[PDB]
Amino acid sequence: VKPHLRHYCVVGRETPSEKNPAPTVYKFEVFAPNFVVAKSRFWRMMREKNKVKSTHGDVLSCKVVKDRKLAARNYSVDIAYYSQRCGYTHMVKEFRDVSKAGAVSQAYHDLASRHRARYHNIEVLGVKSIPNHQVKRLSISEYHASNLSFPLLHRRVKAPRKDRVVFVKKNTKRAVV
RNA sequence: GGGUACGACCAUACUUGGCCGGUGCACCACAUCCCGUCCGAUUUGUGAAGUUAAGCGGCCACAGGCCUCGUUAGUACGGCGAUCAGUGGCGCUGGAACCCGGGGUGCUGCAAUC
């Protein structure tokens, strides 16, 4: 399916004051289902880092970021996450995908299973595309070879839904349902 | 600008130890009387020889304290929420203190006065 997580870049600042007349603007890449969550995660880091809070700031740009292309490539996602079982595991897993958004959402499902880690426990720390060689991880390294061929072994080929059937004659594909 | 009296706030004006120095302030002289003590030390009355030593006030403390703001720290804790997880995160939110550091170390009022 298309990626779970859209790629937002939320930009914002603490709102101007005589206390801080010309406040720093903050860019912040997020991978969120939708902007309202990206805007939220953005204000999470604003208070967890800048001590500025949602009441006192103002997002200047919620906009989603355009995909680099569509060619299959290779992503080093850097993903801190939390648990009672582990309170802050920095962890640069690599994923092979067509987009930063896809590598990242792929990193959430991966991270949610190997670690019972919800979206809001996780925080992406960056998602570089990587060249073939830099990927130390051995799993996706199997897919680098320009000459890689593999079988689609032991397929379950379900019929197109329009054609699916409950009962069929045994060495035939006459329907009987 | 300072001094006096009476002050308001009552340490930024406090404690310590320095140094600094025209009205007055002070210390200072004596106690006859008013008046009071074991004692004129205190207090009281009467003075004006002496001196600023002190008090006083002002300036200095890698002074302490106090005040102020930052750091701490979106930390601690907290309110609300979940068919959350197994105390904790999370979502919406409010949000310190100790500490350390920068600064600071009284200010205003009436009255007569140099």
PDB file of C-alpha atoms (C1' of nucleotides) in Angstrom:
ATOM      1  CA  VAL A   1       0.000   0.000   0.000  1.00  0.00           C
ATOM      2  CA  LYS A   2       0.999   3.641  -0.335  1.00  0.00           C
ATOM      3  CA  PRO A   3       2.992   4.783   2.615  1.00  0.00           C
ATOM      4  CA  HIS A   4       1.407   4.905   5.971  1.00  0.00           C
ATOM      5  CA  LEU A   5       3.076   8.186   6.727  1.00  0.00           C
ATOM      6  CA  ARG A   6       3.115  11.346   4.724  1.00  0.00           C
ATOM      7  CA  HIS A   7       6.291  13.397   4.759  1.00  0.00           C
ATOM      8  CA  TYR A   8       5.615  16.741   6.363  1.00  0.00           C
ATOM      9  CA  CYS A   9       7.970  19.593   7.026  1.00  0.00           C
ATOM     10  CA  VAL A  10       6.413  21.738   9.687  1.00  0.00           C
ATOM     11  CA  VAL A  11       7.941  25.155  10.120  1.00  0.00           C
ATOM     12  CA  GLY A  12       7.160  27.378  13.065  1.00  0.00           C
ATOM     13  CA  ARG A  13       8.386  29.699  15.757  1.00  0.00           C
ATOM     14  CA  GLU A  14       7.570  30.983  19.181  1.00  0.00           C
ATOM     15  CA  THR A  15       5.253  33.905  18.531  1.00  0.00           C
ATOM     16  CA  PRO A  16       6.983  37.310  18.593  1.00  0.00           C
ATOM     17  CA  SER A  17       7.256  39.273  21.808  1.00  0.00           C
ATOM     18  CA  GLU A  18       9.172  42.070  23.491  1.00  0.00           C
ATOM     19  CA  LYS A  19      10.745  39.149  25.314  1.00  0.00           C
ATOM     20  CA  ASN A  20      11.909  37.658  21.995  1.00  0.00           C
ATOM     21  CA  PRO A  21      11.380  40.272  19.246  1.00  0.00           C
ATOM     22  CA  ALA A  22      12.742  38.195  16.350  1.00  0.00           C
ATOM     23  CA  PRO A  23      12.340  34.494  17.298  1.00  0.00           C
ATOM     24  CA  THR A  24      14.116  31.663  15.524  1.00  0.00           C
ATOM     25  CA  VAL A  25      12.084  29.865  12.922  1.00  0.00           C
ATOM     26  CA  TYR A  26      12.315  26.096  13.189  1.00  0.00           C
ATOM     27  CA  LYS A  27      12.078  23.681  10.330  1.00  0.00           C
ATOM     28  CA  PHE A  28      11.143  20.153  11.391  1.00  0.00           C
ATOM     29  CA  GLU A  29      10.755  17.081   9.201  1.00  0.00           C
ATOM     30  CA  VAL A  30       8.061  14.729  10.442  1.00  0.00           C
ATOM     31  CA  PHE A  31       6.509  11.558   9.230  1.00  0.00           C
ATOM     32  CA  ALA A  32       2.886  11.764  10.109  1.00  0.00           C
ATOM     33  CA  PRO A  33      -0.402  10.258   8.959  1.00  0.00           C
ATOM     34  CA  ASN A  34      -1.649  13.756   8.293  1.00  0.00           C
ATOM     35  CA  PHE A  35      -0.697  17.336   9.003  1.00  0.00           C
ATOM     36  CA  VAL A  36      -2.674  17.680  12.205  1.00  0.00           C
ATOM     37  CA  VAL A  37      -0.458  15.017  13.715  1.00  0.00           C
ATOM     38  CA  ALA A  38       2.639  16.409  12.044  1.00  0.00           C
ATOM     39  CA  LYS A  39       1.764  19.769  13.475  1.00  0.00           C
ATOM     40  CA  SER A  40       1.368  18.035  16.799  1.00  0.00           C
ATOM     41  CA  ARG A  41       4.642  16.193  16.753  1.00  0.00           C
ATOM     42  CA  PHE A  42       6.207  19.436  15.744  1.00  0.00           C
ATOM     43  CA  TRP A  43       4.956  21.116  18.882  1.00  0.00           C
ATOM     44  CA  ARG A  44       6.084  18.141  20.832  1.00  0.00           C
ATOM     45  CA  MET A  45       9.664  18.850  19.877  1.00  0.00           C
ATOM     46  CA  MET A  46       9.181  22.569  20.352  1.00  0.00           C
ATOM     47  CA  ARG A  47       8.515  22.122  24.026  1.00  0.00           C
ATOM     48  CA  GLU A  48      10.766  19.140  24.496  1.00  0.00           C
ATOM     49  CA  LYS A  49      13.629  21.024  22.985  1.00  0.00           C
ATOM     50  CA  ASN A  50      12.939  24.739  22.646  1.00  0.00           C
ATOM     51  CA  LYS A  51      10.708  25.055  25.719  1.00  0.00           C
ATOM     52  CA  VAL A  52       8.278  26.870  23.425  1.00  0.00           C
ATOM     53  CA  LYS A  53       4.727  25.466  23.524  1.00  0.00           C
ATOM     54  CA  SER A  54       1.781  25.207  21.170  1.00  0.00           C
ATOM     55  CA  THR A  55      -0.119  28.066  22.787  1.00  0.00           C
ATOM     56  CA  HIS A  56       2.869  30.351  22.392  1.00  0.00           C
ATOM     57  CA  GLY A  57       4.022  29.470  18.911  1.00  0.00           C
ATOM     58  CA  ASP A  58       2.648  29.329  15.405  1.00  0.00           C
ATOM     59  CA  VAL A  59       3.287  26.859  12.623  1.00  0.00           C
ATOM     60  CA  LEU A  60       4.313  28.731   9.507  1.00  0.00           C
ATOM     61  CA  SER A  61       4.038  25.855   7.118  1.00  0.00           C
ATOM     62  CA  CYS A  62       2.472  22.425   7.425  1.00  0.00           C
ATOM     63  CA  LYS A  63       3.229  21.421   3.865  1.00  0.00           C
ATOM     64  CA  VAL A  64       3.986  17.873   2.722  1.00  0.00           C
ATOM     65  CA  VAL A  65       7.284  17.191   0.946  1.00  0.00           C
ATOM     66  CA  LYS A  66       7.488  15.875  -2.604  1.00  0.00           C
ATOM     67  CA  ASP A  67       8.932  12.387  -3.218  1.00  0.00           C
ATOM     68  CA  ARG A  68      12.442  12.242  -4.625  1.00  0.00           C
ATOM     69  CA  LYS A  69      11.244  10.130  -7.535  1.00  0.00           C
ATOM     70  CA  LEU A  70      10.143   6.507  -7.604  1.00  0.00           C
ATOM     71  CA  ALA A  71      13.235   4.458  -8.355  1.00  0.00           C
ATOM     72  CA  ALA A  72      13.870   1.712  -5.864  1.00  0.00           C
ATOM     73  CA  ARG A  73      16.568   2.767  -3.484  1.00  0.00           C
ATOM     74  CA  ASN A  74      17.932   2.444  -0.066  1.00  0.00           C
ATOM     75  CA  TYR A  75      17.267   4.251   3.167  1.00  0.00           C
ATOM     76  CA  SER A  76      19.132   4.607   6.401  1.00  0.00           C
ATOM     77  CA  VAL A  77      16.448   5.580   8.855  1.00  0.00           C
ATOM     78  CA  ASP A  78      17.655   6.723  12.268  1.00  0.00           C
ATOM     79  CA  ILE A  79      14.976   5.968  14.811  1.00  0.00           C
ATOM     80  CA  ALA A  80      14.958   6.696  18.501  1.00  0.00           C
ATOM     81  CA  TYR A  81      12.097   5.044  20.363  1.00  0.00           C
ATOM     82  CA  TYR A  82      10.911   4.349  23.896  1.00  0.00           C
ATOM     83  CA  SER A  83       9.612   1.605  26.129  1.00  0.00           C
ATOM     84  CA  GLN A  84       9.384   0.622  29.763  1.00  0.00           C
ATOM     85  CA  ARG A  85      11.455  -2.291  28.507  1.00  0.00           C
ATOM     86  CA  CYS A  86      13.822   0.197  26.824  1.00  0.00           C
ATOM     87  CA  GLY A  87      13.765   3.905  27.630  1.00  0.00           C
ATOM     88  CA  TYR A  88      15.509   5.332  24.581  1.00  0.00           C
ATOM     89  CA  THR A  89      17.027   3.098  21.944  1.00  0.00           C
ATOM     90  CA  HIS A  90      18.891   5.014  19.300  1.00  0.00           C
ATOM     91  CA  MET A  91      18.883   2.689  16.327  1.00  0.00           C
ATOM     92  CA  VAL A  92      19.794   3.220  12.702  1.00  0.00           C
ATOM     93  CA  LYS A  93      18.084   0.374  10.898  1.00  0.00           C
ATOM     94  CA  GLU A  94      18.209   0.471   7.139  1.00  0.00           C
ATOM     95  CA  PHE A  95      15.229  -0.191   4.890  1.00  0.00           C
ATOM     96  CA  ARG A  96      14.875  -0.649   1.172  1.00  0.00           C
ATOM     97  CA  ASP A  97      12.050   1.400  -0.286  1.00  0.00           C
ATOM     98  CA  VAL A  98      11.018   3.879  -2.960  1.00  0.00           C
ATOM     99  CA  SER A  99      10.688   6.911  -0.692  1.00  0.00           C
ATOM    100  CA  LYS A 100      11.666   8.478   2.616  1.00  0.00           C
ATOM    101  CA  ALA A 101       8.071   8.251   3.606  1.00  0.00           C
ATOM    102  CA  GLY A 102       7.951   4.612   2.667  1.00  0.00           C
ATOM    103  CA  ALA A 103      11.181   3.732   4.409  1.00  0.00           C
ATOM    104  CA  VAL A 104       9.986   5.491   7.500  1.00  0.00           C
ATOM    105  CA  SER A 105       6.536   4.020   7.719  1.00  0.00           C
ATOM    106  CA  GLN A 106       8.232   0.739   7.002  1.00  0.00           C
ATOM    107  CA  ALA A 107      10.406   1.519   9.983  1.00  0.00           C
ATOM    108  CA  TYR A 108       7.386   2.034  12.168  1.00  0.00           C
ATOM    109  CA  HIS A 109       5.802  -1.300  11.336  1.00  0.00           C
ATOM    110  CA  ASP A 110       9.165  -2.891  11.795  1.00  0.00           C
ATOM    111  CA  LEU A 111       9.589  -1.080  15.011  1.00  0.00           C
ATOM    112  CA  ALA A 112       6.058  -1.729  16.271  1.00  0.00           C
ATOM    113  CA  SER A 113       6.498  -5.483  15.878  1.00  0.00           C
ATOM    114  CA  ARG A 114      10.003  -6.145  17.109  1.00  0.00           C
ATOM    115  CA  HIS A 115       9.173  -3.612  19.780  1.00  0.00           C
ATOM    116  CA  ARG A 116       5.690  -3.075  21.022  1.00  0.00           C
ATOM    117  CA  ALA A 117       6.303   0.566  20.167  1.00  0.00           C
ATOM    118  CA  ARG A 118       3.478   2.949  19.299  1.00  0.00           C
ATOM    119  CA  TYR A 119       3.916   5.836  16.872  1.00  0.00           C
ATOM    120  CA  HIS A 120       4.280   8.421  19.604  1.00  0.00           C
ATOM    121  CA  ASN A 121       7.033   6.528  21.374  1.00  0.00           C
ATOM    122  CA  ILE A 122       9.082   6.567  18.213  1.00  0.00           C
ATOM    123  CA  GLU A 123      10.799   9.610  16.761  1.00  0.00           C
ATOM    124  CA  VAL A 124      12.619   9.564  13.453  1.00  0.00           C
ATOM    125  CA  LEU A 125      16.030  11.189  13.618  1.00  0.00           C
ATOM    126  CA  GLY A 126      16.701  11.325   9.906  1.00  0.00           C
ATOM    127  CA  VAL A 127      16.218   9.337   6.735  1.00  0.00           C
ATOM    128  CA  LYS A 128      19.122   9.501   4.328  1.00  0.00           C
ATOM    129  CA  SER A 129      18.967   7.701   1.036  1.00  0.00           C
ATOM    130  CA  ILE A 130      22.010   5.491   1.048  1.00  0.00           C
ATOM    131  CA  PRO A 131      24.233   4.340  -1.775  1.00  0.00           C
ATOM    132  CA  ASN A 132      24.502   0.594  -2.264  1.00  0.00           C
ATOM    133  CA  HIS A 133      27.739   0.119  -0.352  1.00  0.00           C
ATOM    134  CA  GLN A 134      27.223   2.188   2.792  1.00  0.00           C
ATOM    135  CA  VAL A 135      24.544  -0.178   4.080  1.00  0.00           C
ATOM    136  CA  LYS A 136      26.381  -2.210   6.702  1.00  0.00           C
ATOM    137  CA  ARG A 137      23.237  -4.249   7.253  1.00  0.00           C
ATOM    138  CA  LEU A 138      23.406  -7.628   5.558  1.00  0.00           C
ATOM    139  CA  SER A 139      19.707  -8.125   4.863  1.00  0.00           C
ATOM    140  CA  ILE A 140      19.174  -5.487   2.203  1.00  0.00           C
ATOM    141  CA  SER A 141      22.662  -6.104   0.885  1.00  0.00           C
ATOM    142  CA  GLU A 142      21.282  -9.234  -0.745  1.00  0.00           C
ATOM    143  CA  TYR A 143      19.187  -7.035  -2.998  1.00  0.00           C
ATOM    144  CA  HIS A 144      22.024  -4.855  -4.290  1.00  0.00           C
ATOM    145  CA  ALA A 145      23.333  -7.154  -6.993  1.00  0.00           C
ATOM    146  CA  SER A 146      22.289  -5.881 -10.409  1.00  0.00           C
ATOM    147  CA  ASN A 147      22.027  -9.535 -11.201  1.00  0.00           C
ATOM    148  CA  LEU A 148      19.634 -10.762  -8.575  1.00  0.00           C
ATOM    149  CA  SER A 149      17.033 -13.260  -9.612  1.00  0.00           C
ATOM    150  CA  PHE A 150      14.740 -15.119  -7.302  1.00  0.00           C
ATOM    151  CA  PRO A 151      11.746 -17.432  -7.666  1.00  0.00           C
ATOM    152  CA  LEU A 152       8.275 -16.469  -6.425  1.00  0.00           C
ATOM    153  CA  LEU A 153       8.096 -19.788  -4.659  1.00  0.00           C
ATOM    154  CA  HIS A 154       4.991 -21.512  -3.250  1.00  0.00           C
ATOM    155  CA  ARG A 155       2.593 -18.716  -4.227  1.00  0.00           C
ATOM    156  CA  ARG A 156      -0.934 -18.440  -2.982  1.00  0.00           C
ATOM    157  CA  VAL A 157      -2.667 -17.019  -6.027  1.00  0.00           C
ATOM    158  CA  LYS A 158      -6.059 -15.838  -4.923  1.00  0.00           C
ATOM    159  CA  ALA A 159      -8.404 -15.111  -7.799  1.00  0.00           C
ATOM    160  CA  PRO A 160      -9.468 -11.623  -8.730  1.00  0.00           C
ATOM    161  CA  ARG A 161     -12.307 -10.989  -6.327  1.00  0.00           C
ATOM    162  CA  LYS A 162     -14.858 -10.993  -9.076  1.00  0.00           C
ATOM    163  CA  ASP A 163     -13.806 -14.548  -9.879  1.00  0.00           C
ATOM    164  CA  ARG A 164     -13.430 -16.070  -6.418  1.00  0.00           C
ATOM    165  CA  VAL A 165     -15.308 -19.252  -5.647  1.00  0.00           C
ATOM    166  CA  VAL A 166     -16.313 -21.377  -2.643  1.00  0.00           C
ATOM    167  CA  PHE A 167     -16.537 -24.791  -4.321  1.00  0.00           C
ATOM    168  CA  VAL A 168     -14.855 -25.843  -7.539  1.00  0.00           C
ATOM    169  CA  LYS A 169     -14.763 -29.102  -9.451  1.00  0.00           C
ATOM    170  CA  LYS A 170     -11.505 -30.787  -8.503  1.00  0.00           C
ATOM    171  CA  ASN A 171      -9.379 -30.797 -11.666  1.00  0.00           C
ATOM    172  CA  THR A 172     -11.166 -28.025 -13.378  1.00  0.00           C
ATOM    173  CA  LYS A 173     -12.076 -24.489 -12.527  1.00  0.00           C
ATOM    174  CA  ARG A 174     -15.754 -24.842 -13.096  1.00  0.00           C
ATOM    175  CA  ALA A 175     -17.496 -23.048 -10.259  1.00  0.00           C
ATOM    176  CA  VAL A 176     -19.901 -24.840  -7.988  1.00  0.00           C
ATOM    177  CA  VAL A 177     -20.191 -22.537  -4.938  1.00  0.00           C
TER     178      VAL A 177
ATOM    179  C1'   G B   1      25.446  66.781  47.019  1.00  0.00           C
ATOM    180  C1'   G B   2      25.194  66.299  51.737  1.00  0.00           C
ATOM    181  C1'   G B   3      23.471  66.850  57.307  1.00  0.00           C
ATOM    182  C1'   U B   4      19.172  66.804  60.900  1.00  0.00           C
ATOM    183  C1'   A B   5      14.504  65.564  62.606  1.00  0.00           C
ATOM    184  C1'   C B   6      10.006  62.556  61.697  1.00  0.00           C
ATOM    185  C1'   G B   7       9.285  58.957  58.499  1.00  0.00           C
ATOM    186  C1'   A B   8       6.960  54.979  54.560  1.00  0.00           C
ATOM    187  C1'   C B   9       8.684  50.228  52.391  1.00  0.00           C
ATOM    188  C1'   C B  10      11.511  47.405  56.098  1.00  0.00           C
ATOM    189  C1'   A B  11      18.464  43.429  54.330  1.00  0.00           C
ATOM    190  C1'   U B  12      19.532  45.715  47.312  1.00  0.00           C
ATOM    191  C1'   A B  13      19.093  49.252  53.396  1.00  0.00           C
ATOM    192  C1'   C B  14      21.653  42.985  57.005  1.00  0.00           C
ATOM    193  C1'   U B  15      26.810  40.903  59.310  1.00  0.00           C
ATOM    194  C1'   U B  16      31.842  41.280  59.157  1.00  0.00           C
ATOM    195  C1'   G B  17      36.344  43.748  58.291  1.00  0.00           C
ATOM    196  C1'   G B  18      38.479  47.856  55.635  1.00  0.00           C
ATOM    197  C1'   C B  19      39.428  52.698  54.038  1.00  0.00           C
ATOM    198  C1'   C B  20      36.919  58.043  53.528  1.00  0.00           C
ATOM    199  C1'   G B  21      35.371  62.470  55.297  1.00  0.00           C
ATOM    200  C1'   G B  22      30.833  71.797  55.398  1.00  0.00           C
ATOM    201  C1'   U B  23      26.288  72.427  57.868  1.00  0.00           C
ATOM    202  C1'   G B  24      24.650  69.192  62.001  1.00  0.00           C
ATOM    203  C1'   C B  25      24.986  64.785  64.367  1.00  0.00           C
ATOM    204  C1'   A B  26      27.811  62.637  67.800  1.00  0.00           C
ATOM    205  C1'   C B  27      31.168  61.560  71.324  1.00  0.00           C
ATOM    206  C1'   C B  28      32.467  65.129  75.251  1.00  0.00           C
ATOM    207  C1'   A B  29      32.402  68.552  80.444  1.00  0.00           C
ATOM    208  C1'   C B  30      30.073  68.743  85.140  1.00  0.00           C
ATOM    209  C1'   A B  31      26.065  67.558  88.098  1.00  0.00           C
ATOM    210  C1'   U B  32      24.258  72.554  91.639  1.00  0.00           C
ATOM    211  C1'   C B  33      19.142  71.968  90.892  1.00  0.00           C
ATOM    212  C1'   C B  34      14.356  68.870  88.092  1.00  0.00           C
ATOM    213  C1'   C B  35      14.935  63.483  88.080  1.00  0.00           C
ATOM    214  C1'   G B  36      16.850  58.539  88.631  1.00  0.00           C
ATOM    215  C1'   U B  37      20.663  54.572  89.799  1.00  0.00           C
ATOM    216  C1'   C B  38      25.038  49.864  93.895  1.00  0.00           C
ATOM    217  C1'   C B  39      27.386  53.470  90.476  1.00  0.00           C
ATOM    218  C1'   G B  40      24.877  60.379  86.427  1.00  0.00           C
ATOM    219  C1'   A B  41      27.245  53.805  83.219  1.00  0.00           C
ATOM    220  C1'   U B  42      22.318  54.073  81.641  1.00  0.00           C
ATOM    221  C1'   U B  43      18.749  58.280  82.652  1.00  0.00           C
ATOM    222  C1'   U B  44      18.161  63.261  84.101  1.00  0.00           C
ATOM    223  C1'   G B  45      19.500  68.299  84.309  1.00  0.00           C
ATOM    224  C1'   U B  46      23.609  72.017  83.088  1.00  0.00           C
ATOM    225  C1'   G B  47      26.985  73.172  79.876  1.00  0.00           C
ATOM    226  C1'   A B  48      30.661  74.062  75.015  1.00  0.00           C
ATOM    227  C1'   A B  49      36.816  72.876  77.071  1.00  0.00           C
ATOM    228  C1'   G B  50      38.106  68.742  73.681  1.00  0.00           C
ATOM    229  C1'   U B  51      37.928  65.295  69.434  1.00  0.00           C
ATOM    230  C1'   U B  52      35.870  62.494  65.207  1.00  0.00           C
ATOM    231  C1'   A B  53      38.663  57.637  67.988  1.00  0.00           C
ATOM    232  C1'   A B  54      34.009  55.931  67.766  1.00  0.00           C
ATOM    233  C1'   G B  55      28.818  56.478  66.359  1.00  0.00           C
ATOM    234  C1'   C B  56      27.247  58.401  61.832  1.00  0.00           C
ATOM    235  C1'   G B  57      27.471  58.528  56.886  1.00  0.00           C
ATOM    236  C1'   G B  58      30.323  57.036  51.896  1.00  0.00           C
ATOM    237  C1'   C B  59      33.457  53.930  49.278  1.00  0.00           C
ATOM    238  C1'   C B  60      35.813  48.290  49.145  1.00  0.00           C
ATOM    239  C1'   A B  61      35.248  42.887  49.888  1.00  0.00           C
ATOM    240  C1'   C B  62      36.933  36.132  43.654  1.00  0.00           C
ATOM    241  C1'   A B  63      33.137  38.225  51.947  1.00  0.00           C
ATOM    242  C1'   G B  64      28.426  35.612  53.767  1.00  0.00           C
ATOM    243  C1'   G B  65      23.460  37.091  53.464  1.00  0.00           C
ATOM    244  C1'   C B  66      19.510  39.529  50.585  1.00  0.00           C
ATOM    245  C1'   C B  67      17.459  41.080  45.917  1.00  0.00           C
ATOM    246  C1'   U B  68      17.202  40.079  40.474  1.00  0.00           C
ATOM    247  C1'   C B  69      17.323  37.405  36.106  1.00  0.00           C
ATOM    248  C1'   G B  70      18.899  33.541  33.585  1.00  0.00           C
ATOM    249  C1'   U B  71      20.631  27.845  33.916  1.00  0.00           C
ATOM    250  C1'   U B  72      18.306  24.094  35.923  1.00  0.00           C
ATOM    251  C1'   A B  73      14.068  22.622  32.519  1.00  0.00           C
ATOM    252  C1'   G B  74       9.622  21.948  29.422  1.00  0.00           C
ATOM    253  C1'   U B  75      13.111  18.593  33.940  1.00  0.00           C
ATOM    254  C1'   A B  76      10.048  17.445  38.838  1.00  0.00           C
ATOM    255  C1'   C B  77       5.254  17.315  39.857  1.00  0.00           C
ATOM    256  C1'   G B  78       0.485  18.088  38.024  1.00  0.00           C
ATOM    257  C1'   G B  79      -5.071  18.420  35.673  1.00  0.00           C
ATOM    258  C1'   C B  80      -7.789  15.713  31.672  1.00  0.00           C
ATOM    259  C1'   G B  81      -7.936  11.333  28.324  1.00  0.00           C
ATOM    260  C1'   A B  82      -7.102   5.944  26.525  1.00  0.00           C
ATOM    261  C1'   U B  83     -10.948  -1.665  25.751  1.00  0.00           C
ATOM    262  C1'   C B  84      -3.050   2.653  27.244  1.00  0.00           C
ATOM    263  C1'   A B  85       1.553  -0.568  28.715  1.00  0.00           C
ATOM    264  C1'   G B  86       3.095  -3.415  32.635  1.00  0.00           C
ATOM    265  C1'   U B  87       4.968   2.198  37.747  1.00  0.00           C
ATOM    266  C1'   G B  88       5.599   4.229  32.816  1.00  0.00           C
ATOM    267  C1'   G B  89       5.038   6.559  28.520  1.00  0.00           C
ATOM    268  C1'   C B  90       1.601   8.684  25.420  1.00  0.00           C
ATOM    269  C1'   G B  91      -2.362  12.646  23.735  1.00  0.00           C
ATOM    270  C1'   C B  92      -4.378  17.622  25.463  1.00  0.00           C
ATOM    271  C1'   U B  93      -2.293  20.611  28.790  1.00  0.00           C
ATOM    272  C1'   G B  94      -0.267  23.579  33.425  1.00  0.00           C
ATOM    273  C1'   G B  95       4.574  23.690  35.020  1.00  0.00           C
ATOM    274  C1'   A B  96       8.505  24.221  39.549  1.00  0.00           C
ATOM    275  C1'   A B  97      12.298  24.148  43.365  1.00  0.00           C
ATOM    276  C1'   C B  98      17.278  23.173  45.076  1.00  0.00           C
ATOM    277  C1'   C B  99      21.467  24.476  42.491  1.00  0.00           C
ATOM    278  C1'   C B 100      24.853  27.068  39.882  1.00  0.00           C
ATOM    279  C1'   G B 101      25.866  31.601  37.160  1.00  0.00           C
ATOM    280  C1'   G B 102      25.127  37.404  35.501  1.00  0.00           C
ATOM    281  C1'   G B 103      23.651  41.488  37.617  1.00  0.00           C
ATOM    282  C1'   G B 104      22.676  44.025  42.110  1.00  0.00           C
ATOM    283  C1'   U B 105      23.577  45.742  47.357  1.00  0.00           C
ATOM    284  C1'   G B 106      18.175  50.711  49.192  1.00  0.00           C
ATOM    285  C1'   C B 107      14.829  53.715  47.843  1.00  0.00           C
ATOM    286  C1'   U B 108      11.109  57.540  48.378  1.00  0.00           C
ATOM    287  C1'   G B 109       8.304  61.513  51.614  1.00  0.00           C
ATOM    288  C1'   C B 110       7.651  66.045  54.834  1.00  0.00           C
ATOM    289  C1'   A B 111      10.388  70.009  57.556  1.00  0.00           C
ATOM    290  C1'   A B 112      13.976  73.366  58.634  1.00  0.00           C
ATOM    291  C1'   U B 113      19.410  73.357  56.794  1.00  0.00           C
ATOM    292  C1'   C B 114      24.746  73.730  54.941  1.00  0.00           C
TER     293        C B 114
END
